[PDB]
Design a protein around this ligand. Structure first.
Ligand SMILES: OC[C@@H](O)[C@@H](O)[C@@H](O)CO
Length: 399
């Protein structure tokens, strides 16, 4: 087989695709003879360890799962192979027309160059407990104000029942969840010239309402949750509503992992007044480390093409990757039977906003700064105005 004797080392975010990539290693070795070693890490550790590998030119990782919001940093620093030529050369293998253009562009490209190739696309959705809403006589929320109101109505500590959950963990997790909320109210963290605007009066008001919501309606231990932690909370039955990525939805219908099978609805994220549908897109691309040997680059690209092929990518998603990205997947009889929320995913990608969160080179640093600020506010250590003022000062140093 062509890749006999080859080892590929892949650094992966600990989203559901980390375990699925680990599982698919066997089939990849059966198909190509290559040994795929997947190292799954949490978001911060992943970013730290792979950035150090790039900077040191040490060639420890051949393949890295690159977050959409890292695309500008990857392009500016040349961390990854520019895949533009190979995408064009091998397009017929990739069935590009069957990948939504917003996904190819936003998860793969920056400034017209492929720094990665999309392998896991996420739609921003509201997950809610159908049973709890029905019992309470409440309609499906469509406005962020409904979310606040319903979250309070559905909080009753006496039954260990919380109306709402979101991330509290310092850093990217807490930052991203506040950013999502702010986006749905038409807010931003950059001004119209792309410069930091973390502490605008709108954002201070937004964070003030968000803090009140978090303190009043989320499980008390939510101050420590990252994405996986709040997904687990929701699956366990603890919270009535959660704004999340579609990646979490396979888990809700898994009886081995879920106390809410049959109980969860998936809809578009609610919006503030005057705000049009936000169809937020996120996810991860697969990058090849620019430092590795030519034969390692060739093998890594062979792996990428294998993974995104219709056959394997369907298997990937039937195994729970929650990473749907192909038009063909949205009408596929098996995928639609297993995952009845794909109409919402498809509508999101058809209208997708691949700039739902910034992808500029400064963003990963902004994200960490904002994460410290929002966590200090949710923990009761700093007030919204002072915290965002401080964050703005630090963010401006990057420009
Ligand atoms: O599960 C968390 C998810 O991987 C992050 O929000 C990424 O930033 C999505 O692009």
């Amino acid at each position: 087989k062509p890749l006999d004797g080859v080892t590929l080392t892949l650094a992966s975010q600990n989203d559901p695709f980390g375990a699925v990539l680990t599982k698919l290693a066997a089939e990849f070795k059966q198909d190509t003879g290559a040994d795929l070693k997947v190292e799954v890490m949490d978001y911060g550790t992943l970013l730290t360890k792979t950035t150090a590998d790039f900077v040191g030119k040490t060639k420890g990782y051949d393949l890295v799962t690159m977050d959409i919001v890292w695309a500008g940093a990857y392009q500016a620093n040349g961390y990854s192979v520019d895949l533009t030529d190979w995408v064009k050369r091998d397009a017929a293998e990739l069935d590009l027309d069957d990948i939504y253009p917003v996904i190819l562009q936003s998860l793969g490209q920056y400034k017209g160059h492929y720094v990665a190739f999309p392998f896991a696309a996420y739609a921003n959705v509201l997950a809610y407990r159908k049973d709890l809403f029905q019992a309470a006589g409440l309609p499906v929320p469509t406005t962020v104000e409904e979310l606040v109101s319903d979250a309070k109505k559905l909080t009753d500590p006496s039954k260990k029942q919380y109306g709402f959950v979101a991330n509290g963990q310092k850093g990217p997790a807490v930052a991203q969840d506040w950013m999502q909320y702010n986006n749905q109210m038409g807010g931003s963290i950059l001004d119209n010239d792309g410069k930091p605007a973390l502490n605008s009066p709108e954002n201070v008001k937004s964070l003030t309402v968000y803090k009140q919501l978090f303190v009043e309606t989320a499980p008390p231990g939510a101050i420590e949750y990252d994405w996986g932690g709040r997904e687990e909370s929701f699956r366990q039955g603890a919270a009535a509503m959660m704004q999340t990525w579609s990646v979490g939805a396979p888990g809700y219908s898994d009886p081995a992992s879920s106390n809410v099978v049959g109980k969860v609805g998936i809809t578009t994220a609610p919006v503030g007044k005057g705000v049009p549908p936000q169809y937020g897109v996120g996810g991860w691309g697969m990058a090849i480390n620019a430092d590795i040997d030519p034969k390692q680059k060739e093998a890594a690209w062979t792996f990428i093409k294998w993974l995104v092929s219709k056959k394997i990518h369907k298997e990937f998603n039937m195994d729970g990757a929650g990473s749907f990205m192909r038009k063909s997947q949205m009408t596929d009889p098996d995928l639609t039977a297993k995952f009845d929320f794909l109409p919402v995913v498809a509508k999101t990608y058809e209208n997708g906003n691949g700039e739902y969160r910034p992808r500029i080179p400064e963003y990963p640093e902004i994200q960490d700064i904002l994460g410290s600020a929002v966590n200090s506010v949710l923990a009761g250590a700093a007030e919204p105005q002072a915290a965002l003022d401080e964050a703005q000062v630090e963010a401006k140093k990057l420009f």
